[PDB]
From a paper:
The biophysical properties of C-type cPcdhs pose a number of interesting questions: Despite their more divergent sequences compared with alternate cPcdhs, AUC data have confirmed that C-type cPcdhs αC2, γC3, and γC5 form trans dimers using their EC1–4 domains. However, γC41–4 behaved as a very weak dimer in AUC (KD >500 μM; Figure 2—source data 1), nevertheless full-length γC4 can mediate cell aggregation when delivered to the cell surface by coexpression with a ‘carrier’ cPcdh. However, there are no published crystal structures of C-type cPcdh trans dimers. We therefore sought to crystallize a mouse C-type cPcdh engaged in a trans interaction and obtained two distinct crystal forms of γC4EC1–4, one at 2.4 Å resolution (crystallized at pH 7.5) and the other with anisotropic diffraction at 4.6/3.9/3.5 Å resolution (crystallized at pH 6.0). However, the 2.4 Å structure had an apparently partially disrupted EC2:EC3 interface resulting in a total buried surface area of just 2900 Å2. Left, surface views of the two trans dimer crystal structures highlight the difference, with a gap apparent in the EC2:EC3 region of the interface in crystal form two that is absent from crystal form 1. The difference between the two structures may be due to differences in the pH of the crystallization and its effect on the ionization state of the three histidines present in the EC2:EC3 interface. The differences could also reflect distinct states of a dynamic interaction, as has previously been observed crystallographically and explored computationally for other cPcdh trans interactions. The published crystal structures of γA1, γA8, and γB3 also show partially disrupted trans interfaces though in differing regions of the interface.
Residue numbers in the entry:
A (entry chain B), B (entry chain A): 1 to 418
Write the structure that this text describes.
């Protein structure tokens, strides 16, 4: 087999080989035998010189259009002479040149990756095309510097490279939602030729954040006289997720007792906590309960918060006077110290607001004695004479130590007999 | 201050204290002084024995109805004597007993936790109620043995416990979707009393699985004569998620070239890959393309798979005989060795299916000569005499080396002249 190598895309008139010498034809015989290539197609690309007997390129040859991705491109040639008419055979090897640069069919590649994609997941990329073969084909892929993505290039069944995008670090759309990358494919030509593609990565949102309250817990003070409809506090919570998944609404915890719901209500949009009814420090001095903020995701994320409402005592009770026992009538002969009445006082308020003092006018022949807390006896403190006064209206005044103090008035009526 | 402790729910006649001796009353004069409890309410629960002067329980006292959740329960008592008329005061401390067991308001508690909940996330639980106070109130919560959940119990300023369920290890609904737990609350009484609640936690599904092919790649061999509509392979992929997120459908990759789409089709539900048109080993010997499986989730998860289809050569071409040149007429005086015809053969099949041998009948005065691959010249091999035979019909037979071989027949017609 006579084999001539010649590079593809060679100019018209390029020397391939001297077939006349290799077929053992005489030079003078060459001008007579009129050696020519047989076959209509091959006459477009090859020609035989009548003077030298050289096989020459007629029209440039494209190896890619002829053999595609085959490793070797060999063109069998047949020749004809006259006198006598004879046929000869030779093979022309078309040697590949690097007339193709790597090129991605689309130069804009867009990937949408979920925010919760696990590191180690591979994402396919469309590979560049290089119609050349051998070392002139694609030799490596490159990915521009970044912090979350790397390249994982796989070799498929024939030995072509298949590039895949590999997630190295977890994503977080709340920190970075978009990545702009450049992907490069380079062949092993001399010099290497390359082509690039722009890779835009989008991070899709997951509902991975619960709402966050402004403070971890709230403690509030309110006077027990506060009217219904007063705003105690406005709860604020934020959620960084997108759309309804970042939309915060407020409510009581599911386990909130009705004793809380009776006095407090929570506006679902504004988070304003209002007072719904009368408070009373004397019955309950504080309330502890939990509230929650929910996002509008499906399903929803929840966050709880602890609320404490402290009541402040108000001096809303005047002292209560109990006259336990009462003489009614007293002999004018009674010795000083005679008990006229037993008196008890109570004030339900706290601290100084509930501390009671008792008094009567000085000018009376009576006095107040106390042996135990909040207990007073009304006794005679001087002599009595019916002819002077037949009866006494003894004005008793109880007062608490609030500011200002509140007073209670009670009159003990006492008849005097002989 | 005279203070007597007495446990709540004590029977009638229980000894509280010797008030007379603490009030410093003469022992011989009790029947005269007639020490008595003052106040209608306190007279329902306490009475003074006239002979001994001891304060006794009349009707049993409920500490819970009196003080609720307060730590200390103190009842001021007032007493009255006659001869002389006097008032005395003492305090009774009502001591809590352990007459309340812990009790959850609901015996069935249900939690729905997302499969992708991060470890360390907390979930509220409805606390049990124990109306007692002090050591008789709830002292600890317990959670049955398990591997993913623990308790995080918070202590408030008054001593109330707030139980929270704490996720310790990551969940996976594809491995276990339901957890059955019992939650227990115990007080610190002697003996300790407790109550339980049934806790059912369910794991909600996330679309965290892409479909999985049975094999990482498939390689198929098919004869180039295979008829249209033949099933080459059935792709199988599973997706363990729930609902549409676990429903798999098949398709070609988005970038699949039309030369592939023209010959192969993929049923979206069954995954059967069928043949759509004629194959030809002589023009194309293999096809490589990617297929994908998508679930019905929103957004959809997909996994790609690489397919390679290799064609097998069939002996579907008999050799082709080309008679390049033919003398047609020959003089009987011509010397042996004269070339009568030029013959080239070709068979497009590969291997033994494409190797051609040539022959002619033995008895003829002709022979076949070959100087180049697949080129034969028909020459005279003996003397020729016109008077004997004026013309020859030379039967040339080409055969390939297939089993069974395929043959081609061509006759060279030759006239002889004088
Ligand atoms: C993707 O997945 C698909 C589906 O997978 C299946 O379905 C899913 C849902 C799962 O359950 C999965 O586990 C399943 O596998 C899968 O396609 C299947 O591929 C299988 C092979 O890989 C194939 O199995 C064959 O089934 C034949 C019967 O099928 C009939 O019934 C089924 C179910 O009802 C129908 O779908 C189907 O259309 C048919 O109607 C079965 O006969 C084959 O076994 C014979 O052949 C074997 C090798 O060819 C051989 O090893 C076996 O031993 C058996 O050989 C026969 O043995 C009997 C008894 O010994 C002989 O009978 C006796 O003969 C003696 C004389 O010899 C005497 O006459 C006695 O009297 C007589 O009883 C008989 O002669 C033997 N035959 C031969 C030819 O030798 C084989 O098991 C499934 O059908 C496929 N399913 C479908 C739905 O198509 C794909 O493979 C997966 N894809 C990939 C890429 O893997
Ligand atoms: C939950 O969030 C809400 C809302 O938050 C606000 O909106 C968010 C979108 C975001 O932007 C966030 O940053 C905002 O703060 C909270 O409610 C807000 O609370 C703050 C603080 O408690 C209040 O600020 C006060 O604003 C008034 C003016 O408010 C008028 O105009 C507002 C619009 O700009 C309206 O929204 C109001 O309705 C009202 O019409 C200021 O006057 C206050 O400053 C003065 O008083 C404080 C002490 O209270 C002093 O420290 C300051 O120095 C100011 O004093 C004045 O100074 C001038 C000049 O020196 C002097 O001439 C005056 O005499 C001084 N006056 C006095 C009285 O000394 C505050 O800045 C917001 O009004 C309130 N907004 C709403 C809508 O309610 C809420 O607190 C939060 N929840 C929790 C638990 O934190
Ligand atoms: C939340 O939902 C309401 C309707 O309920 C809508 O008007 C609002 O725009 C949404 N987003 C925010 C941030 O409030
Ligand atoms: C997928 O959805 C279709 C809708 O009709 C249903 O018929 C089919 O059974 C589903 N897939 C599986 C694997 O069940
Ligand atoms: C692509 O890459 C090749 C090799 O790195 C370069 O030679 C070319 O200029 C292009 O940048
Ligand atoms: C790679 O770089 C080329 C320019 O060399 C661009 O055309 C391409 O879009 C990518 O950025
Ligand atoms: C709750 O726990 C207490 C103390 O462990 C038991 O006595 C009771 O039976 C219940 O199981
Ligand atoms: C805890 O266990 C008790 C039985 O000891 C049940 O009655 C209760 O409902 C919970 O399961
Ligand atoms: Ca070319
Ligand atoms: Ca080339
Ligand atoms: Ca190239
Ligand atoms: Ca995030
Ligand atoms: Ca998010
Ligand atoms: Ca959210
Ligand atoms: Ca009050
Ligand atoms: Ca008060
Ligand atoms: Ca008061
Ligand atoms: Ca009780
Ligand atoms: Ca208890
Ligand atoms: Ca109790
Ligand atoms: Ca899972
Ligand atoms: Ca899942
Ligand atoms: Ca899935
Ligand atoms: Ca064929
Ligand atoms: Ca064939
Ligand atoms: Ca053949
Ligand atoms: Cl590479
Ligand atoms: Cl609510
Ligand atoms: Cl009274
Ligand atoms: Cl009065
Ligand atoms: Cl006495
Ligand atoms: Cl009594
Ligand atoms: Cl505990």
């Amino acid at each position: 087999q006579i084999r001539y190598p010649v590079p593809e895309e060679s100019q018209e008139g390029t020397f391939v080989g001297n077939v006349a010498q290799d077929f053992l034809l005489d030079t003078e015989s060459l001008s007579a035998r009129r050696l020519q290539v047989a076959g209509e197609v091959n006459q477009r690309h090859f020609r035989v010189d009548l003077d030298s007997g050289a096989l020459l390129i007629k029209n440039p040859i494209d190896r890619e259009a002829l053999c595609g991705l085959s490793a070797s491109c060999i063109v069998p040639l047949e020749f004809v002479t006259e006198g006598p008419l004879e046929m000869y055979r030779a093979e022309v090897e078309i040697v590949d040149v690097n007339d193709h640069a790597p090129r991605f069919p689309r130069q804009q590649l867009d990937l949408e990756i979920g925010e919760a994609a696990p590191p180690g997941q591979r994402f396919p990329l469309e590979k560049a095309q290089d119609a050349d073969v051998g070392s002139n084909s694609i030799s490596s892929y490159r990915l521009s510097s970044n912090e979350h993505f790397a390249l994982d290039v796989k070799k498929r069944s024939d030995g072509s490279l298949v590039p895949e995008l590999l997630l190295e670090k977890p994503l977080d759309r709340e920190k970075q939602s978009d990545y702009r990358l450049v992907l490069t494919a380079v062949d092993g030509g001399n010099p290497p030729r390359s082509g690039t593609a722009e890779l835009r990565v989008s991070v899709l949102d997951v509902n991975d954040n619960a709402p966050a309250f402004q403070q971890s817990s709230y403690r509030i003070s309110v006077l027990e006289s506060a009217p219904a409809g007063m705003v105690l506090i406005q709860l604020n919570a934020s959620d960084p997720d997108l759309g309804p998944s970042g939309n915060v609404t407020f409510s009581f915890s599911g386990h909130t007792p009705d004793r809380v719901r009776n006095l407090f209500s929570l506006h679902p949009t504004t988070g304003k906590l209002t007072l719904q009814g009368p408070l009373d420090f004397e019955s309950e001095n504080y309330y502890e309960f939990d509230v929650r903020a929910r996002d509008g995701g499906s399903p929803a994320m929840e966050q709880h918060c602890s609320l404490r409402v402290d009541l402040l005592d108000v001096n809303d009770n005047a002292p209560h006077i109990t006259v336990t026992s009462e003489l009614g009538t007293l002999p004018e002969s009674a010795e000083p110290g005679t008990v006229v009445a037993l008196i008890s006082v109570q004030d339900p308020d706290s601290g100084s607001n509930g501390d009671v003092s008792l008094r009567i006018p000085d000018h009376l022949p009576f006095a107040l004695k106390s042996a135990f807390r909040n207990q007073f006896s009304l006794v005679t403190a001087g002599p009595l004479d019916r002819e002077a006064r037949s009866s006494y209206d003894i004005m008793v005044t109880a007062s608490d130590a609030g500011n200002p103090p509140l007073s209670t008035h009670r009159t003990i009526f006492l008849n005097i007999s002989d």
